[PDB]
Amino acid sequence: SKGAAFVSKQEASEVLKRPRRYLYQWLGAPVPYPDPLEPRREVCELNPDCDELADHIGFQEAYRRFYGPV
């Protein structure tokens, strides 16, 4: 439980979980749950943000160091 990296035993051991899907949405649209590998890397349709890269650990601090207080 020391940071975002670690998880508890309970959350790690839930096999029967509702999966958020790399392609399209679990909520709607065809073929979300099957994986086509060749298509380009993009995720659930939302506001004009292309990728999940901003969800990485420590993104805000590194971005502030490099490009200042945006």
Added chain:
Amino acid sequence: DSRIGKLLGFEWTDLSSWRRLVTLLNRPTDPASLAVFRFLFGFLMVLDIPQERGLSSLDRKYLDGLDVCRFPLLDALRPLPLDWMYLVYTIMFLGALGMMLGLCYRISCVLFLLPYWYVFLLDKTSWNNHSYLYGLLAFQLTFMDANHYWSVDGLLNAHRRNAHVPLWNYAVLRGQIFIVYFIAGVKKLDADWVEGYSMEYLSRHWLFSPFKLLLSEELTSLLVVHWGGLLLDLSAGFLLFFDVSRSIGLFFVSYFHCMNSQLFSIGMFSYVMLASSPLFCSPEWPRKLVSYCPRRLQQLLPLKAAPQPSVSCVYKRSRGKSGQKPGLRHQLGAAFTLLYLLEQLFLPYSHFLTQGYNNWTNGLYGYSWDMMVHSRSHQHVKITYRDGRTGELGYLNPGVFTQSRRWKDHADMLKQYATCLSRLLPKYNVTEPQIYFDIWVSINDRFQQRIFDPRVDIVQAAWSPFQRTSWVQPLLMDLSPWRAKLQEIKSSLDNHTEVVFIADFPGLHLENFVSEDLGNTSIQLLQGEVTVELVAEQKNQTLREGEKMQLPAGEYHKVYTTSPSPSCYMYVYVNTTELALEQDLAYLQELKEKVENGSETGPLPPELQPLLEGEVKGGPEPTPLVQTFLRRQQRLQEIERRRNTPFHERFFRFLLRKLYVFRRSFLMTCISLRNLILGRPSLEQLAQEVTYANLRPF
């Protein structure tokens, strides 16, 4: 004169000796089609750099100071700082522009080639067939004399203006496209493609609507989607070469590429293939097209006069002079053509040498041309770590310190991830760890099953490229026919119940924790022998075929396999909390409908007043049920409004978004080039510029 000579374009006697082969492979040929293809390829790569190569998103992928686990082919390769990466992409853009305009063609091709392969080899997760094809085409075009017609370098140099080129420039490109089509076709001669499992659900797209007038969906998903693709791959391989079958081949191939562009999000690959299709036509089609225009257009379009002699071709001398002896560049061209085509044929089937990369599929993805042949789906991923000092056991967030998710399917990427975690965890108070992985995955709708041994420490595991990995679980092809029966079980359920099918090896066991929400969960055994243990009271029951058990909700349980063969079972569960919330929401909706239509004359409860008002102002905070109802109603209205949108608005938004991407890429590149050249200013100025760069166009 001979029919074989006319059909194939060369006589048998031309192949009798090496010298005649060199002469055949360096005969004069018109340059026009090659020039048109060079222009189109340059334009498409220029459009592709700011979109798929990731220049717009590169500020959030190679950010300095961030700790990320990379996946390069060679561990020696490492990214440069962000600014030098933007300089590299700038050099790529300049090379692409030079190739498009044909200005300093060889330097432009080199400047596009070296950075492209540097970026390609740096990350294995961004590999795919249509990037490998672009790399190969850039490699081929570096040597070809594609700047002899409709090129700025022709205007700056008389000797290279509308000149002949050797035949092998066309031969290599035609061979590449033929190899792509034929290898893709043969790779799709698989049990999962000819039977209707891969791409089973793509028949529901509205583009296939006319086919449904004459065929059912089940046949439409087999005859048209699957068999049609194979037949078109082989035929488009063969038809385009011969003059008789070129028109029908062009029509079918254009239709095929347009549909692939609309159905998928592959990118510029469909347009590149469309631009490569005309090369099987005669070499001189742009010239006759230019001839068939009014004089006013001819004053602007390229030259129509016959091409002049060149020096990079072997000219047969009919003046009685002895034939021109081939020099060195001609022999090198012939050898390059033969060896390159042989290597291109060999490489897709080179998976028996690099066995370290082999998996349930064959080798790394990108250079096999097996497009849309295998579809995978993952259920669970558990990463356990044991500390080397205290002995504590803990669990990691599955997608930690990573940006892609192909590491769940390849042993080598798993080993790199394990080493990265080993180096990084000591920053988080963890000594020399031992890391274990447990990943469940199913390919083409089979039983979900482990892919790596969950009892092997990946940090200290053994891996070499040219030896088979000893901790990759085999794929059970003996359980394939069950995919029939399972589908029937998928159709026997209500709108709420859900099913998950599991197959497990002997000796191994699965520990699971049913959450409190998933009440009324059951486990049924399909084949083999298992024992289900509840740890709350330490009670284990052995289940035989066709037996069902009601598992606890909110407690741990374990399933052990105790048969000589793998055991297959199934979890069938229903989410009780969602059901109760849905019933309550339906009751509330019924009450508001009674209020609106005049019924329920009595005063409404206070908790219902926010629903009619629709706004929380000057009153108590709403209950969670009211908030959920209002959120659902607002979401439904938003979706309904989105559906009712005219086409022109969607087109305008698409154009504005693309313009935003291009503008952001250009501004970020300019900022970093200024940083490199004139140095880095204060933080406030950097923040101001970055805020300006991200602004929406409006």
